Curated annotation (Swiss-Prot), chains A, B, C, D, E, F:
Protein name: Alpha-hemolysin
Effect of H144L: 16% of normal hemolytic activity
A Pfam family recorded for this sequence: Leukocidin
GO molecular-function terms, A-Z: identical protein binding; toxin activity
Lineage: superkingdom: Bacteria
Domain notes: The mushroom-shaped heptamer is composed of a cap domain (comprising 7 beta sandwiches and the amino latches of each protomer), 7 rim regions whose protruding strands may interact with the membrane bilayer, and the stem domain (52 Angstroms in length, 26 Angstroms in diameter) which forms the transmembrane pore.
Keywords: Cytolysis, Hemolysis, Secreted, Signal, Toxin, Virulence
Effect of mutating H48L: 7% of normal hemolytic activity, reduced toxicity in mice
Membership in a protein family: Belongs to the aerolysin family.
Source species of the chain: Staphylococcus aureus
Subcellular location, record wording: Secreted
Function summary: Alpha-toxin binds to the membrane of eukaryotic cells (particularly red blood cells, RBC) forming pores, resulting in hemolysis, with the release of low-molecular weight molecules leading to eventual osmotic RBC lysis. Human RBCs bind much less alpha-toxin than do rabbit RBCs. Heptamer oligomerization and pore formation is required for lytic activity.
Gene Ontology cellular component terms for the protein in this record: extracellular region
Record note on quaternary structure: Self-assembles to first form a non-lytic oligomeric intermediate, and then, a mushroom-shaped homoheptamer structure of 100 Angstroms in length and up to 100 Angstroms in diameter. Interacts with human ADAM10; this interaction is required for toxin pore formation, disruption of focal adhesions, and hly-mediated cytotoxicity.
Amino acid sequence: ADSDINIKTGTTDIGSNTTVKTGDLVTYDKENGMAKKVFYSFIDDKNHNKKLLVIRTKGTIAGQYRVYSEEGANKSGLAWPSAFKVQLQLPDNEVAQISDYYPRNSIDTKEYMSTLTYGFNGNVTGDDTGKIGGLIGANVSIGHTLKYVQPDFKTILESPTDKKVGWKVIFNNMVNQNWGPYDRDSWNPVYGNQLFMKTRNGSMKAADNFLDPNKASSLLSSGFSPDFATVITMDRKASKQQTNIDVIYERVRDDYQLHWTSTNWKGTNTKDKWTDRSSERYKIDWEKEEMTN
Amino acid sequence: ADSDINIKTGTTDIGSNTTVKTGDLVTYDKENGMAKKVFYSFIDDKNHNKKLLVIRTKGTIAGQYRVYSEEGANKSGLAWPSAFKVQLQLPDNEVAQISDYYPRNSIDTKEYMSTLTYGFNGNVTGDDTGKIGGLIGANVSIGHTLKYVQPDFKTILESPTDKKVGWKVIFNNMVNQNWGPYDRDSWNPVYGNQLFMKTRNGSMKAADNFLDPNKASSLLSSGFSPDFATVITMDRKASKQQTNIDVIYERVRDDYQLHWTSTNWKGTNTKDKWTDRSSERYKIDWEKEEMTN
Amino acid sequence: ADSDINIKTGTTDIGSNTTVKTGDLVTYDKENGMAKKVFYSFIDDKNHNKKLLVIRTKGTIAGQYRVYSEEGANKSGLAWPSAFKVQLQLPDNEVAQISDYYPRNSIDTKEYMSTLTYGFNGNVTGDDTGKIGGLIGANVSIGHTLKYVQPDFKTILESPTDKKVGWKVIFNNMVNQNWGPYDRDSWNPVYGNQLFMKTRNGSMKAADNFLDPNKASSLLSSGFSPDFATVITMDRKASKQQTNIDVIYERVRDDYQLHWTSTNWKGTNTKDKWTDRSSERYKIDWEKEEMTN
Amino acid sequence: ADSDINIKTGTTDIGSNTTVKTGDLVTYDKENGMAKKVFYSFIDDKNHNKKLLVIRTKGTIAGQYRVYSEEGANKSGLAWPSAFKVQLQLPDNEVAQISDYYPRNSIDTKEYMSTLTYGFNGNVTGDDTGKIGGLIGANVSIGHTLKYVQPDFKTILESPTDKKVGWKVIFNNMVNQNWGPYDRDSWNPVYGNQLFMKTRNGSMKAADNFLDPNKASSLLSSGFSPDFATVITMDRKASKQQTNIDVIYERVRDDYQLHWTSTNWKGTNTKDKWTDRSSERYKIDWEKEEMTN
Amino acid sequence: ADSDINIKTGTTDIGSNTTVKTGDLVTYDKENGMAKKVFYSFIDDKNHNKKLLVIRTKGTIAGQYRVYSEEGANKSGLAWPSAFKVQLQLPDNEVAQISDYYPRNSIDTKEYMSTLTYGFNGNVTGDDTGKIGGLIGANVSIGHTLKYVQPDFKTILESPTDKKVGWKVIFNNMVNQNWGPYDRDSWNPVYGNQLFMKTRNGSMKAADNFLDPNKASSLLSSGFSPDFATVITMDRKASKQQTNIDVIYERVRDDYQLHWTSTNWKGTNTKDKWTDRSSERYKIDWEKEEMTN
Amino acid sequence: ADSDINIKTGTTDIGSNTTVKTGDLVTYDKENGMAKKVFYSFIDDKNHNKKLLVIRTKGTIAGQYRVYSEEGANKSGLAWPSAFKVQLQLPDNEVAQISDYYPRNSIDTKEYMSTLTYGFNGNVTGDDTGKIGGLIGANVSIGHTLKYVQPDFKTILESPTDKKVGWKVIFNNMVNQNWGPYDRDSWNPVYGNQLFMKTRNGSMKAADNFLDPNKASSLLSSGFSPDFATVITMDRKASKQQTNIDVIYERVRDDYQLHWTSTNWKGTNTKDKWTDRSSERYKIDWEKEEMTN
């Protein structure tokens, strides 16, 4: 930061002595259950070598945790969102470029703990029969503990270019009624993958044996609200001062299935079975400082 | 945030050099025990592509933890609020759109901890009878701990469109005199669902065997105070500059019942037995910047 | 908050470009041991659709932890405050309305923790008699911990209307010289309710066997200092621009009794035995922007 | 706070557009070891219904941890401060009132923790004599822990009126060389009250057997520095515009005694043996805005 | 900081009363999978003895976690990024100098904990055969725990000169499905280096036995986003007012191999097998305050 | 604070609309190893009833951890600083007074924790001889833990008057290579006081058997940097407008001695063996607003 290098805070920032033009474009995609919002800002600071557009992609991609199959009362399936994604792309031949984006991938950490105990102990026994007994003992104990935080979903920056950027918010793992965490690959030899299994051997129909949505990450039903920022830079001298950009919002759904064996419930998870893509083109007008869809 | 992408803090925000018009509209619905308050703000920032209205839905929905039935001294029932909801909806044909809303669903987390211990230990025994004994031993120990926060109620953003948004504040689980937590589905083979059971086998009448409201989440009696924000955007060019909007406040009540067996008290819980809906239409005047009810 | 929805912090707030008129009214009620203070502010912001009055109810309600009866040296009683309350009410026919209030009821939470440990261990025994012995062992361990905060008193918002609001600060539970917590319903078959019992079988007179007030919540003796805010809104167009409001401060006292059995001390607690209500009417003048009592 | 009720921070506060007159009055009371300082501020804000005086009582009451008696080398006593107090009082006849005071008594809390562990374990024994043995075992464990903070001294607001306010800072409990805590009533059948006892059976003279003051709360020797605020309000219309006010600073000392039995040291504590009171009258001039002593 | 040495905060900082010229240069290196962004700022403060340029090197170096070989179904290899690097260098003969850089190397810490427990215990035994027994025992236990945080990657400032500076972000260690941490040198006699091994003896092909990328540091796939600052100072008096500077972004990849023994999977890691270097020259114009590439 | 009593933050403070005159006086006392710095500020605010001088006493008193005696190779001594002190005193007859000082003595606290565990357990034994055995058991456990912070040195305000104030920074206790803490009175029957003893029975000369200063609090060698504030108030009316003030900096050294017994090293500590006092008189000129030495 500025102060670490002896510079008054906010001296190197863009956007003082400049009117900034902003706007909202909201599109609801009924077919894909995605409320899409772009909030943009043009910043033409004459002390900066280029024009800037900051595009904030917001809105909410519905989870759409749908209990689908019902082929008997022994078999049931749940489509669930294992990934949410937002991507932006400038066409191949445009002069505008992707200059920055937030957030980015941060370095994860963990606490490591080692312990060492030495112990000495003694005994003196004795009955009324006048018999005395004794014990001298020692022990060593070496321990290690590893402690880290595990978010239900991880938010990842996909490797940008100067023409494309995106994020994926991927299912990581989750607690199911105090057991777990379970994840997409959990495997118990008897119960299979218990990720969304309500009971090991309850006697309801299959379709009633999924974890109550209220007891699961609320991103799985009500859905995820992106909050991502992209900065696009544009040369003042360029011939063409109109740029197109494509924004895709994406839901990736896995397929969690329950079946009754003879004795108990067993779950399966299949990765990436369905993908919903909602694609929109936006027109960036650098002269008027407007985005339209 | 602005500074992550080299931009002076608050450059891209809306609402400088603008008079903002605000107001309060308060309606008490006596029949449903809901104090409803809208606090609104019109922000017409000429550097923004659209007019904005921020609607804050506040007030307090009473819990209404009512001990109802009394059919003998063996049977009693308690109506209790398992969910509170606030929803806003712009009619089908309006040009105004829902642009934003706060709060949203955030990613839940958990702490995971694993431990490994190795142990060596030794003995020398001995009595007065001159008899010497000895012991050499080892042990391994693998451990895991999972730690996470469990609020009494969860606050959840329901999947928005460009025409509707709502929140539901749903009962999650709760401690009953240091036991539990219990939830809507708790089931002990003998005591049933102990969620609101004061005693396992006290000899009061049924109606006196419910947990003291003061010892339960105060949302259950005194009630919940919504504090939600919705942003509505409107085109300056639209022909009709008057918008209608509906706000519903909602209480969902479960039915917790106690009955005496021969030996002890048993509780049952039935989901979503009663719903109270309080609906209000508001008129948004974009030219005069007033909301009325 | 403003920034979450792309709005410059404090844009939607009331009370810029406005002189605010404030005042203090202090009344001491000698009979009921209540110092009552109203601090008010009229905020007439012309960009807001209504006039506002913010009424802050402060002061201090003395605890009045009185050791009362002394009928012998075997029997004694303690009056103690189990609840403090502040309530405001606008008369039935007034046009002013209660628009807001702080604080409100917060969602309580709790930390849940589960542990699982597996263990293997081995032995080699041996005496001087040349005899060798052996042991192989295993173990499982499943654990859970629940952790939550328990304040001595809870502060609760009573379900408001548009005409009334109040808070009650109620006794929750308390530690007695490192035992407990105890509460209003604690019951040990031998000692009864030990809430304020200094000793199980000391030989002082009963009146000397109550916990030292310095070792209890200081709300019990020195008392409670309310700090509550109520916002009243009024129409600029109303005919009547004078409004009455009533404020009650209230102390509810329980009755904790000690008696000697043949062997030990036993305590009893009786709920809500005495109530002290101090009522004041205030006159709100919206034209002059004054409150008087 | 302002923002909780949609109001720009600091709108409702007193004291903009006002010259504030302040002053210091310092008095040292040599007999009682009390440095007394009043820092005052008159705020006449014309938008407030009354004139205000903020009186801050500061300075330092010396502890005066004196090892006093020495009647032999078997008997010794220690005078030590168990309480410090500051009180302000407006005479009977005054029209000025005490309007506020800080700090106040806040609600104490505690963390409660419950634990439940189930355990299974197995064995297989065996010697060279071909003899096989076996063990199957189970265990349950229910736990509770209570966790709270215990300051060495508690700071308590004494129940104010409109004419008097005071604080007492009272000894709560203390650690003695890692043992305890002990308090004023600690009682071990053999050692008595060990609060300030250096050793159980050292062979120094009694006067050398007290805890080193540097190893005790520093309030006990170097003393306590009050930092309390009182607000006095006065009517602009009042006839007499001069107000008297009395301030007492108080030290209460207990008497901790050591005596040798035949075998060990035994300690006694006697409550409230000596009280030092330093009283000062201050003249408040509301027309000139000065306080004098 | 300023205030620690009695100086008004921000008095000693550079860059008030000065127009600052900034710019963005973005270059995507397709061959090396590196998005490179330079954000620069020239600050010519006339109260400072030299001109300054702050160069912020950002963008993203893709991880490029490629599962490469497939020579049978017994042998597979993974190229993975063990280091990312950014370096700046001024040519030999330039008068400009590297003056500062952020971040720098921090002192790491660790918590140390020692424990001592003494234990006494006693028994009285007895059967129906009238026989009485007894046990007296003691134990000592001396313990230590060491606790520290271990990031997945460390960020290190390479020893600067006045002509060069760089950072390397190097793989440190990582958790593999709750085991580990493992690092580049982990060696288990049977399993080899388990760093990226999914299973010890699953029966898939080798290429399917690598840890799921979503379960590993996201720096390994999606990649690292540098965020580094360099300050270059230049003399006003210098004859040549143009400076060249080279910036290298670098990916170092290790080679993790899996092979089947007869019984289980074994992993190997070879350090620094592939290096990708992307080099760019930039032209600094001190008179016009522009950087170009 | 201001806001607790409804007053705009910083309204009651001294020192707006006032030129403040400040200065530094530095004196190094070579003989006593004390760098003494006074930083002062005169604040003559006409809205305050008196003139103020703030005197900040800074600099550094060197530790002077000197291994002194060497009378053989069996006996050695270490002079070490057990206290550092700064005091200010206005002569008897001066009209100026000490009005305030920072820091002051704060109330210490501690965390207290109690635990109660109940346990039930069972067994089934058995040999090949067909013989079955059994065990039923219970256990109780009552626990307490006490947790508090112990700084190496305590910083204490000595009881001020209106004419004198000082601080002492006194040695409290310390860890010696992970053992201890030890303090001035530690006493082990065999090793004596181990405070600064490097080894129990190493065979170096005594002078080489002291703890490495780098492994001890750095106040013990490199020394202590006072940072204390005193406020002096003066009447505008006074005849004499010149005030003298004395500032003493002080080092108190204990004497830790090691001697070899026949078998091991034994340490002694003697309190307060050497005192170094560095005294300076300063002249305060209230008319010119200067301090000189």
